[PDB]
């Protein structure tokens, strides 16, 4: 079909990992690409795109409507996860191409929210170690990892579970650590490099900002060793 569309690798990875039949909030919707195409497929049975401000929200109403997709997709605009209700009966819920910090507080914000949905696919461009400290502290588990080049992007898969994580799990991630792909340890590899110019760019008198960057350092060396 000519109206099919193909999504970037980044937000594929993401589709691959919502579960079928799914009915799912993508809070902040790149221009509804990715609930048209979970749709269109019928790998999803009901999706809204929750947009913050008004271009990015009339771009996914004009999209979806193109796409012939206005009784499946419902495009909101609310700030967070208020861009669901109850009645919508939301299962899953997906953000991506947002910092760490920033899901970690989008998330925080609604925590109440969560209580009713099964599974978050979580696509962070850094800071992925603070996303991991928030998921840990509030009764989230991570089941899933993926780490995707493009740049490089994690993708984590998370329900509802208590997880306790150590400092290199937080920092590297469970599974991406397990697993020890070819894309991780060039990310980690690339991290160091950084690190090093860093290190070596800042005088000795600064002892403080010097050490968090050795301590940094020595977490990469052992896991890249
Ligand atoms: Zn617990």
């Not at 790149?30 to 929750?50: K, N, S």
Request: proline share 3%; with cysteine; glycine share 6%.
């Amino acid at each position: 079909n000519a109206m099919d569309l193909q999504l970037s690798k980044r937000l594929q990875k993401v589709a691959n990992y919502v579960p079928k039949g799914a009915r799912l909030l993508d809070v902040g919707s790149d221009h509804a690409y990715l609930p048209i195409f979970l749709l269109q497929m019928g790998y999803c049975d009901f999706a809204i795109a929750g947009e913050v401000v008004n271009g990015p929200y009339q771009s996914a109403l004009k999209n979806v409507s193109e796409h012939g997709l206005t009784s499946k997709i419902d495009v909101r605009l609310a700030n967070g996860l208020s861009a669901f209700e109850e009645a919508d009966n939301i299962d899953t819920i997906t953000i991506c191409g947002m910092g760490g910090r920033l899901i970690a507080d989008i998330l925080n914000n609604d925590i109440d929210k969560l209580q009713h949905v099964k599974t978050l696919v979580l696509q962070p461009n850094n800071r992925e170690d603070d996303l991991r400290k928030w998921l840990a502290a509030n009764d989230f588990e991570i089941v899933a990892e993926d780490i995707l080049t493009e740049k490089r992007y994690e993708i984590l898969v998370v329900k509802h579970g208590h997880m306790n994580l150590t400092a290199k799990e937080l920092r590297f991630g469970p599974f991406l650590l397990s697993n020890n792909t070819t894309v991780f340890k060039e990310k980690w590899q690339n991290e160091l490099n950084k690190l090093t110019f860093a290190l070596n760019s800042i005088p000795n008198s600064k002892m403080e900002e010097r050490a968090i960057l050795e301590d940094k350092i020595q977490d990469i060396k052992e896991v890249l060793d």
